Amino acid sequence: YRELEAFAAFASDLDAASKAQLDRGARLVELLKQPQYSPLAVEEQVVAIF
Amino acid sequence: LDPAIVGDEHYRVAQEVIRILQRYKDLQDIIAILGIDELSEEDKQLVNRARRIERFLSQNMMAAEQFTGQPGSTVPLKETIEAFDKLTKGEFDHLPEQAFFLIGGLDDLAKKAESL
Amino acid sequence: TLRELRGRIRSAGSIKKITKAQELIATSRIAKAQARVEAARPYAAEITNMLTELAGASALDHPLLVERKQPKRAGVLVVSSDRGLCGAYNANVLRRAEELFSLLRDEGKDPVLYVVGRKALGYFSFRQRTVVESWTGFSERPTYENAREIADTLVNAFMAGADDEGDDAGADGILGVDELHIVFTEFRSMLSQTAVARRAAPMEVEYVGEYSFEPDPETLFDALLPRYIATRVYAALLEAAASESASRRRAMKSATDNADDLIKALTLAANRERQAQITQEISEIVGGANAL
Numbered sequence: 001y002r003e004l005e006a007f008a009a010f011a012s013d014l015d016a017a018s019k020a021q022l023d024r025g026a027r028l029v030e031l032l033k034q035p036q037y038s039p040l041a042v043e044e045q046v047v048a049i050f
Numbered sequence: 051l052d053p054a055i056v057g058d059e060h061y062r063v064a065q066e067v068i069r070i071l072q073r074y075k076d077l078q079d080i081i082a083i084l085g086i087d088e089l090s091e092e093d094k095q096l097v098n099r100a101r102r103i104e105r106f107l108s109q110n111m112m113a114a115e116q117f118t119g120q121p122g123s124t125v126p127l128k129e130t131i132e133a134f135d136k137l138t139k140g141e142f143d144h145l146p147e148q149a150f151f152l153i154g155g156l157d158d159l160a161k162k163a164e165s166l
Numbered sequence: 167t168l169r170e171l172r173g174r175i176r177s178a179g180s181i182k183k184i185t186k187a188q189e190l191i192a193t194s195r196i197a198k199a200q201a202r203v204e205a206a207r208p209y210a211a212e213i214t215n216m217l218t219e220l221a222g223a224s225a226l227d228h229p230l231l232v233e234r235k236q237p238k239r240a241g242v243l244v245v246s247s248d249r250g251l252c253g254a255y256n257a258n259v260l261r262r263a264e265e266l267f268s269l270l271r272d273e274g275k276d277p278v279l280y281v282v283g284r285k286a287l288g289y290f291s292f293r294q295r296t297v298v299e300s301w302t303g304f305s306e307r308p309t310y311e312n313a314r315e316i317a318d319t320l321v322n323a324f325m326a327g328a329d330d331e332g333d334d335a336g337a338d339g340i341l342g343v344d345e346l347h348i349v350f351t352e353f354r355s356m357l358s359q360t361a362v363a364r365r366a367a368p369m370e371v372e373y374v375g376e377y378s379f380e381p382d383p384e385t386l387f388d389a390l391l392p393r394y395i396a397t398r399v400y401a402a403l404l405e406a407a408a409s410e411s412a413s414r415r416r417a418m419k420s421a422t423d424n425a426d427d428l429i430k431a432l433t434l435a436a437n438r439e440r441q442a443q444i445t446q447e448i449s450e451i452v453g454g455a456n457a458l
Contacts, residue, residue, distance in 0.1 A: 010187045012194045083424050087253050087417070091292060 001025025063134055067103065070138075074100040098143055105150040106137060123154030171436040175429060182425035188251075189418035196411050203353075203404040210397050217390055221371070224383045229325060230391060231369045238330060239275050240345030241323065241367075242266065243316075245402070246283025247410045248305040253417040255351070255410055256285050262349055262361040278343060305407060313400035320346060320399075321392055324367060343367075350402050351409040359409045366398065 004022055008014060014022075031048065034040075053061045073096060077089075086094060112122030133156045136142065142159075149163040244263050246256055270277055281287050282301045290297060299319075304312055327342020335341050346367035351359055369391075379386065 006183070007186070007190065010191050010194075013197055083428065084421065087257070088251060091289065 001029075059135070060131055063131060063138065066138055067134070070096060070100050071104065074104075095140075095143075099138070099140060102142065102145075102147065102150060103134075103137055105147060106153075108150070108152055110152045110154060123158075125155055129155060168436070168439070171432055171439075175432055175436075178425055178428045178432070182422050182429070185418045185421040185425060189415055189422065192411055192415035192418060196408075196415065199404070199408040199411055203408050206397075206401060206404075210401060213390075213394055213397055217394055219377060220379075220383070220386055220390060223377070223379075224387055226371060228369075228388065228391070229328070230321075230367075231371075233368050234327070234344040236344075237273055237275055238327070238344050239277060239341075240270060240347065241278050241280070241320075241343040242347040242349065243280040243320070244282070244286055245350050245406050246281070246286040246305070247407075248283060248285075248302065249414075250285070251417055252410060252414050255413045256289075258361050259286065259349065259351070260289065262363055266347060266349060266363050305403075305410075308400070308403040308407070310396075310400055313403065314396050317392065317396040317399045321395065348402065350406045353405055353409045353412065356412065359413055366395075 001021065001024075004018065004025075008018070008022065051061070051064070077093065077097070081089065081097075086097070089097070110118075110120060110122050114120065114122070136156070145159075145163045146166065149159065149166065153159050153162060242263075244259065246259060267277065278298060279290075279295070280298055280300075281290060283305055284302050287297070287300050287302065301312065301316065323343050324346065325342070326338045326340050327344050328338055329336030330338060330342050330344075333341075345365070347363060347365050349361065349363040352362045353359060
């Protein structure tokens with residue numbers, strides 16, 4: 001996903017699978033963020049990653 | 051070197067030559083990667099002039115008699131300054147580059163250029 | 167030094183990345199240009215078939231069909247782009263135009279020129295050459311209106327040279343051209359693009375060997391030819407733009423390729439410099455220590 005943003009930062013036309021993979025990567029990166037003083041248990045993290 | 055001791059023409063020609071060479075050195079960094087395609091013609095002209103002059107600074111002294119086997123030459127200063135003024139004027143730009151290697155005077159310059 | 171090396175490294179790295187990015191811009195626009203270029207084929211095919219059918223059973227006589235009996239002058243039109251970083255595309259255009267001018271100079275005719283694009287306009291402005299009229303701002307995206315007006319201007323200019331004997335404009339009242347040329351570039355392949363210069367001012371007819379007309383046949387004929395000229399002119403533009411973009415992409419690709427090595431070399435030099443400074447400082451501190 002990073003190697004593909006390094007290429008397609010200015011892309012308008014792409015392969016459909018490439019666009020889908022880029023969108024999935026962006027969604028996962030935006031999900032991985034977590035604030036401070038916020039410990040989590042295992043179950044909610046497993047649900048979130050699923 | 052000072053205008054109080056040297057003629058004004060010498061001072062002016064020297065200053066112009068230094069400015070041209072300095073400009074070429076400044077643009078040498080950018081031309082190293084892209085080349086001449088992106089560069090505008092207003093600088094291509096000075097690039098060609100600078101290349102021709104810096105090739106014209108070469109000379110064939112007598113000292114090489116035992117290396118290249120060719121006699122050397124000497125030039126009076128008036129001929130040198132007039133020839134350099136002519137070259138800075140841009141009259142010689144049509145002539146090929148490889149004609150300016152190891153030449154003594156402007157007459158030999160013309161003879162070599164016409165010989166090719 | 168160190169700060170200069172770090173600055174140059176960051177500069178060259180970002181230059182390389184965005185050269186690749188602009189190469190991607192060119193690659194993306196290539197698909198749109200290629201899709202757009204091939205949409206005018208049926209109209210041209212139909213109009214050519216119509217002209218063949220009409221000229222088959224019509225009289226062969228027209229000012230655009232007949233030739234001026236004397237070689238007075240010859241016009242020409244030169245096209246270009248509206249953005250830089252195209253490589254040698256504009257250089258190729260200028261070389262082809264100059265070689266066509268050289269070929270025409272053999273007859274001693276004083277030619278006239280028209281230009282499209284800012285780059286060629288500026289280059290001819292620097293040189294000592296006259297210009298009649300310039301068109302700019304639509305090489306990126308043309309339409310039918312500009313092609314139609316250009317064709318109209320060319321047709322009227324050709325017609326305005328009916329009786330230009332010597333320097334006299336005759337009943338025309340203005341000096342008119344007698345010959346026209348067009349110089350452009352063709353899309354042979356993704357890597358094959360060459361300049362093509364052709365002459366299409368006076369029509370010529372070739373018999374390869376072997377309907378009903380409600381209006382006047384000559385009326386249909388002379389209404390028809392300007393449409394054919396306009397269609398040819400319009401068809402040239404999209405081809406020129408596509409070839410421009412195709413040549414544009416390779417420049418950015420090669421720019422990235424060349425940008426990598428400067429990064430490599432400057433990193434090596436910085437490594438050597440820092441190693442030297444560390445070894446010299448440790449040597450000097452030990453030398454100061456042991457002597458006392």
